[PDB]
Structure formats: C-alpha cells, structure tokens
Symmetry: D2
Subunit: 106 residues, 4 copies
C-alpha cells in the first residue's frame, strides 16, 4: 500500500474503534493500524520529495511513526486485557500524534 | 511532594516551556516535570480514596503516569537535540494525557 | 527508601518473578519494582555526589530509570494478559538495563 | 525485503555501529535498522507457517519487533545527541532482544 492509502486505513480503523462493542473488534482494528503504520514507515511525503532520505526533515517525519506505533502497541495491550473503554480512549488520544505530523508535513 | 503539589509543578513548567527561548530552559523544565510525575505515581487521588491499591481504577490511574513519563522522556530527547520548537510542541501535545486523566479521576 | 535499598527491592523481585507460578505473583512483583524505580528516580548516586543536578552525568543517570520503568510497564501488561512466561522473559531481559547503568555509575 | 533479508540488514548495521567513529554513521545504521524492523514486522517465520496470524504465537512474535523498534528509537536519540559511545552501547544491548526472539522462534 502507498502513503495516503495507509493513512485511510488509519482513519477508518479509528472510526471502527470509537464505535466498537467489544475487545476483539478493537483488537483487530488496532492490529490493522499497526500494519498500516509499519508500511507507511519508509514512504516519502509529497511535501518532502525534494529532500533526501538523510535530511533533518525526513528523519523527523519518520520519528512521528515511531510515536504512533509505540502508542498502537500500548492500546493493543489494553485491548488484550479487555479494558475496552481504556483502549478506546488511548485510540482517541493518539490523534494528537496524527495531528502533530499533519501540521508539519501534510 | 504531594499530588496537588506535583500537579502544580507540571502545570508551571508547561508554561515555562511554552515561553522559553533556548534548549537549556526546556531541558530543565521537562526534567522537573519528570520528577513530579515520578513522585505522583504512588499517590492516591481523592476520588479513589475508597478504592484499593489493587483496584481497576487504581491500576488505570497509575497507567496515565507511565504515559506521561514516556512522553516527557521523548520530549527531553528533542530538547537535548536543540530541536527547541519540536520539544515545545511535544510539551504542548501532552496536555492530551493531562486532560484524559483529569476527566476520569479528578 | 534510599537508593541501594530501592535497588534491593529491584533485585529481590526479579528473583521472585523468575521463580513464580502464576500471573498474580508476577503482577505484584513488577508493581513493587515500578514503585522502587519511581522512588529511585531522583536519587544521587555516590559516584556523582560532586556533580550538579544539571550535569550531563546526572541527566544520563536519570535516563536509565526511564528505560527501566518503560520496560516494567510493558512486562506488567504481559502479566495482566496472563502471558506469564512472556512476562518472566521480559523481566529477565531488562537486566540488560540494570547492567548498563551499573557499568557506568555504580 | 523478505524476513531473512531484514535480519541481515539488522546484523550488518550492528557491526557498522560497533566499529563507527562518528555519529552520522551510527545515525545512518540505526535508521536502516528501523526500516528493516518495520518491514519485518509483517513477516511470518518458518517456524509458524502452520499457525494463524491470530495465534498466541504470532502475536508474541510480532511483539518482539515492537520492543526492538522502541529500542532503536531510543538509541537514535542518543546518536542525534552526539552521545556516540552511549548509542553504541545501546546498540550492543539490544542483542538481548535479538536473542530472545531467536531462542523462541528461529
Ligand atoms: C493517526 C492515527 C493518523 C491518521 C488517522 C491519519 C490519517 C490521514 C488522513 C485522513 C490524511 C488525509 C490525506 C488525504 O488526501 O485525504 C492523511 C495524510 C497525511 N498524513 Fe496522516 N494519518 C495519521 C498519522 C500520520 C502520521 C503519524 C504522520 C507523520 C509521521 C502523517 C503524515 C501524513 C502525511 C505526510 C499526509 C499527506 C500525504 C500526501 O501524499 O499528501 N500522518 N493522514
Ligand atoms: C500534565 C502535564 C498535567 C497537568 C499540566 C496537570 C495539571 C493539574 C492542575 C493545575 C491541577 C489542580 C487545580 C487546582 O486549583 O487545585 C491538577 C490536578 C490533578 N491532576 Fe493533573 N495534571 C497533569 C497530569 C495528570 C495525570 C497524568 C493524572 C493521572 C494520571 C493527573 C491527575 C490529577 C488529579 C487526580 C488532580 C486533583 C487531585 C487533588 O487532590 O485535587 N494529572 N492537575
Ligand atoms: C534493575 C532491575 C536493577 C537491579 C537488579 C539493581 C541491583 C542493585 C543492587 C542489589 C544494589 C545494591 C546491593 C545491596 O543489597 O547492598 C544496586 C546498586 C546500584 N545501582 Fe542498581 N539495580 C538496577 C537498576 C539500576 C539502574 C537502572 C541504574 C541507573 C540508572 C542503577 C544504578 C545503580 C547504582 C549507581 C548503585 C550503587 C548504590 C549503592 O551501592 O550505594 N541500578 N543495584
Ligand atoms: C536484533 C538486532 C536482531 C539481529 C542482529 C538479528 C539477526 C539475525 C540473523 C543474523 C539471522 C540469520 C538469517 C539467515 O539465515 O541468513 C536472523 C534470522 C532470524 N531472526 Fe533475527 N535478528 C534480530 C532480531 C530479531 C527479532 C526481534 C526477531 C523476532 C521478533 C527475530 C527472529 C528471527 C527469525 C525468526 C530468523 C530466521 C528467519 C529464517 O531463517 O527464515 N530476529 N536474525
Ligand atoms: C479481559 C476480560 C477477561 O475476562 N479477560 C480474561 C481474563 N484474563 C486474565 O485475567 C488473564 C488473561 C485473561 O484472559 C480478559 O483478558
Ligand atoms: C544542541 C544540539 C546540537 O546539535 N548542539 C551543538 C553541536 N552538536 C550537534 O550539532 C550534534 C551533537 C552536538 O553536540 C547543541 O548544542
Ligand atoms: Zn487524498
Ligand atoms: Zn501501557
Ligand atoms: Zn513527594
Ligand atoms: Zn504555581
Ligand atoms: Zn523520539
Ligand atoms: Zn550495599
Ligand atoms: Zn554491596
Ligand atoms: Zn508490549
Ligand atoms: Zn520487505
Ligand atoms: Zn537462512
Ligand atoms: Zn539463506
Ligand atoms: Zn532472501
Ligand atoms: Zn531515551
């Protein structure tokens, strides 16, 4: 999958999580988010097509994904404990990371 | 320090960070934040005086601090990297965590 | 709690985990480790009594605790997920963090 | 890149790091390590071709990558901070993660 396309998988699963009823559903939604993040990992964003893979601005772009993945990692443990509402809140809270990268590189 | 006291330290240093000029100032403010968070970890909040240290709400209260500390850890690396504005935004973004716990347990 | 003493709580519970039988035992051992680390957080080590709270060396000493706490945080989730052996391995593996700090500052 | 291929990228850059002189070299090697880890994340290992992507076994295989990635993230901060030797030692210490997974699923 491509960048914008991974981003839509991130967006749709966030919606899936918000609305879910049970631990297995968030389980699965977060799992798909993790894969999408992992895929996005090496992608070059339109805004930075000029920059090299070594620039400060590529390094900082990627860093945003480390944060996201670490946060999906944690939400997933909460899910795996059947702290369903707790996992939804963590899912909701990670929008701060989405936003922080969008405001810089999108 | 007690829990309200640690919270003030957190709120104050956030202000310090927002307004700061150089890396050393942010470094220092985050460092104090990290100590306050570390101290607050063991505390019992008024709202849960009547629950047990082993409660769901106690295990979830504590968890918020691990999030915050992890996020202060990261912002500090940015500061140490002279990515000052980057560190200020990370500082800014962890109000998400502050708020999430306040809504629940304040 | 004073530093060496927190360290002994860290060492004793590591033994406890290594030998445990059930999830609840490891839960409790890791919980106590977490509190010990959180207390140790701000302590000044003998080797650095002449250094300032702001020095590079104090910052780097503190950093080691960030790592330990984040690793205890993770191991705890594994315990809470009834993945007992997985949690014992994670407990076993964070000896690397113990060691890395001892070799520098002990 | 395939699983075995990502593993060699991991092993090679570890060497590169061991032997390095300056921080850009470590920076660059860790960066490549993170991409390899990110790519590997989705892989199915030969030992579990017969289990399902939903298994206890697959969930636990994947978890090891999150650990490794989290550890590469941290070591990279150290590199970015010109704490070269510190970054080398962190690189070295994450062999504990490499080994833990190999003992289990290689
Ligand atoms: C976090 C969970 C997250 C979500 C959700 C998300 C979604 C998303 C949308 C909905 C878009 C709009 C693109 C469009 O054309 O409609 C979008 C675009 C970009 N994002 Fe994103 N995205 C999330 C996270 C992140 C993170 C963590 C980063 C940076 C590390 C990031 C970056 C970007 C970039 C760049 C784009 C634009 C890409 C382009 O080709 O125009 N996003 N994402
Ligand atoms: C995050 C950086 C954070 C900030 C900032 C913050 C601020 C803050 C203030 C200013 C108050 C008190 C206002 C008054 O007039 O008394 C306050 C109080 C509480 N907080 Fe807080 N706080 C932050 C973080 C967190 C986190 C992460 C938690 C839980 C995980 C948490 C909890 C609480 C609680 C409980 C109180 C009030 C308890 C009391 O004895 O009054 N805070 N915070
Ligand atoms: C990690 C899990 C960990 C263990 C285990 C550990 C053990 C330990 C002991 C048992 C002592 C004192 C022996 C006694 O009973 O008298 C001790 C002392 C020190 N440590 Fe340690 N320690 C662990 C973790 C860490 C970490 C993460 C750091 C660095 C940030 C660190 C450092 C030190 C230092 C310095 C001492 C000297 C204390 C003293 O003897 O006065 N340790 N440790
Ligand atoms: C950590 C940085 C790490 C290193 C280093 C590493 C090395 C490594 C080598 C050298 C091989 C040999 C491959 C070959 O046949 O040519 C290898 C293979 C496997 N590894 Fe690995 N590996 C590191 C990390 C990890 C982690 C985190 C896991 C699990 C989460 C893991 C597992 C495996 C598996 C499985 C193989 C075998 C693949 C195959 O032979 O088809 N490794 N690794
Ligand atoms: C979340 C709700 C629930 O019932 N379970 C099962 C209980 N459980 C443990 O206590 C440890 C593993 C486990 O399944 C949940 O995880
Ligand atoms: C803070 C970040 C920074 O880079 N510097 C000065 C020189 N320096 C680097 O540029 C990279 C490591 C290093 O010491 C700061 O003072
Ligand atoms: Zn689009
Ligand atoms: Zn957690
Ligand atoms: Zn106190
Ligand atoms: Zn004040
Ligand atoms: Zn970071
Ligand atoms: Zn002693
Ligand atoms: Zn002794
Ligand atoms: Zn984990
Ligand atoms: Zn590949
Ligand atoms: Zn092979
Ligand atoms: Zn081969
Ligand atoms: Zn191949
Ligand atoms: Zn760090």
């Amino acid at each position: 999958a491509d960048l914008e396309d991974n981003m839509e998988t991130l967006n749709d699963n966030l919606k899936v999580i918000e609305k879910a009823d049970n631990a297995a559903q968030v389980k699965d939604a977060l799992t798909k988010m993790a894969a999408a993040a992992a895929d996005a990992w090496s992608a070059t964003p339109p805004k930075l097509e000029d920059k090299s893979p070594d620039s400060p601005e590529m390094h900082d772009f990627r860093h945003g994904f480390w944060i996201l993945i670490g946060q999906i990692h944690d939400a997933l443990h909460l899910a795996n404990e059947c702290k369903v509402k707790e996992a939804q809140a963590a899912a909701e809270q990670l929008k701060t990371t989405c936003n922080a990268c969008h405001q810089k590189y999108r």
